[PDB]
Swiss-Prot record, chain A:
Family the entry assigns: Belongs to the herpesviridae large tegument protein family.
Cited function: Large tegument protein that plays multiple roles in the viral cycle. During viral entry, remains associated with the capsid while most of the tegument is detached and participates in the capsid transport toward the host nucleus. Plays a role in the routing of the capsid at the nuclear pore complex and subsequent uncoating. Within the host nucleus, acts as a deneddylase and promotes the degradation of nuclear CRLs (cullin-RING ubiquitin ligases) and thereby stabilizes nuclear CRL substrates, while cytoplasmic CRLs remain unaffected.
Location of this chain's protein in the cell: Virion tegument; Host cytoplasm; Host nucleus
Subunit structure: Interacts with host CUL1 and CUL4A; these interactions inhibit the E3 ligase activity of cullins. Interacts with inner tegument protein. Interacts with capsid vertex specific component CVC2. Interacts with the major capsid protein/MCP.
Biological classification of the source: Viruses, Duplodnaviria, Heunggongvirae, Peploviricota, Herviviricetes
The protein's name in its UniProt record: Large tegument protein deneddylase
Swiss-Prot record, chain C:
Signal peptide (from-to): none
Subcellular location: Virion tegument; Host cytoplasm; Host nucleus; Host Golgi apparatus, Host trans-Golgi network
Disulfide linkage: none
Family per record: Belongs to the herpesviridae inner tegument protein family.
Stated name of the protein: Inner tegument protein
From Swiss-Prot, chain D:
Shown part of the complete sequence: 1609 to 1657 of 2241
Quaternary structure note: Interacts with host CUL1 and CUL4A; these interactions inhibit the E3 ligase activity of cullins. Interacts with inner tegument protein. Interacts with capsid vertex specific component CVC2. Interacts with the major capsid protein/MCP.
The protein's name in its UniProt record: Large tegument protein deneddylase
Cell compartment(s), UniProt: Virion tegument; Host cytoplasm; Host nucleus
Known function: Large tegument protein that plays multiple roles in the viral cycle. During viral entry, remains associated with the capsid while most of the tegument is detached and participates in the capsid transport toward the host nucleus. Plays a role in the routing of the capsid at the nuclear pore complex and subsequent uncoating. Within the host nucleus, acts as a deneddylase and promotes the degradation of nuclear CRLs (cullin-RING ubiquitin ligases) and thereby stabilizes nuclear CRL substrates, while cytoplasmic CRLs remain unaffected.
Superkingdom classification of source: Viruses
Family, per entry: Belongs to the herpesviridae large tegument protein family.
């Protein structure tokens, strides 16, 4: 089943790509934490 | 007993999630202003 | 106008001092005149009006900077400056984005360290706000190419 | 002397809760690290 592969495994392209990500100016102003952060797709619990 | 503590993040993106009930167990047919 | 009143009253005080001028030798009158002059000059340096600042060549950044300096050096009685700031920021919304950086690179630029406060309480829309939260805002572009096109050299 | 500005700053900042700006800002592993952990555990 595709659900098993999607849940217990992830796509290798996410592993290959860069992990850290930047953010934009447009919310009520960010702090240091929000400035450079891990991409939500790459982050795992 | 306390297991976890969490904080609401200031970031938000609208999920727009479409939930589907996977009909693994179809129910019995409905029979009779 | 408050300026002519200040001028005439300080002229009266000068005439009074001239009447009291000749006996400058005495230590009592020395300290009396010393304290009088201290108080009057400390009051006069703060009670400056804001008429002379506005110029036709002044840009949006120049005007907000002039009234920002007015706030940070004179807030005793001139309380409408914040209201004028709030009114003016809505006028220059399109012009405010021309002289700013991206988020990620603006903070590392030289000289943004000292101007972070003026920038923060420029963007927030209230000069009474305090940057205690350590937030990162669109940092102002201090480059000469941007400054010349967006500022005036006289009000640096 | 402390020998460092940051040493003195972080030593005299010890008032009540440790970090204040971190609270003020009001703010999970890379999937590659999870994968390499799983692979290394399996291999070992």
């Amino acid at each position: 089943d595709t659900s098993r592969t999607a849940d217990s495994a992830l796509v290798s392209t996410a592993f290959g790509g860069s992990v850290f990500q930047e953010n934009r100016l447009g919310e009520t102003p960010l702090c240091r934490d929000e400035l450079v952060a891990v991409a939500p797709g790459a982050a795992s619990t | 007993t306390v297991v976890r503590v969490l904080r609401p993040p200031s970031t938000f993106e609208q999920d727009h999630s479409r939930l589907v009930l996977d009909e693994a167990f179809p129910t019995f047919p409905l029979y009779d202003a | 106008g408050q300026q002519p009143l200040v001028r005439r009253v300080i002229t009266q005080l000068e005439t009074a001092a001239t009447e009291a001028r000749p006996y400058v030798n005495c230590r009592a009158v020395a300290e009396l005149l010393d304290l009088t002059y201290q108080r009057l000059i400390y009051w006069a340096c703060t009670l400056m009006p804001y008429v002379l600042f506005r110029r036709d060549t002044d840009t949006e950044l120049d005007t907000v900077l002039l009234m920002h300096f007015f706030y940070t050096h004179y807030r005793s009685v001139n309380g409408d400056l914040a209201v004028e700031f709030q009114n003016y920021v809505k006028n220059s919304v399109r012009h405010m984005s021309s002289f700013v950086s991206s988020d990620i690179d603006g903070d590392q630029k030289p000289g943004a360290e000292h101007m972070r406060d003026v920038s923060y309480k420029l963007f927030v829309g209230n000069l009474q706000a305090r940057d205690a939260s350590g937030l990162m805002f669109p940092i102002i572009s201090t480059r000469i190419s941007t400054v010349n096109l967006y500022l005036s050299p006289e009000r640096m | 002397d402390y020998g460092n500005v940051a040493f003195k700053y972080l030593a005299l900042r010890d008032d009540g809760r440790p970090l204040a700006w971190r609270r003020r800002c009001s703010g999970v592993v890379t999937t590659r690290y999870k994968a390499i952990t799983v692979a290394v555990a399996v291999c070992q």
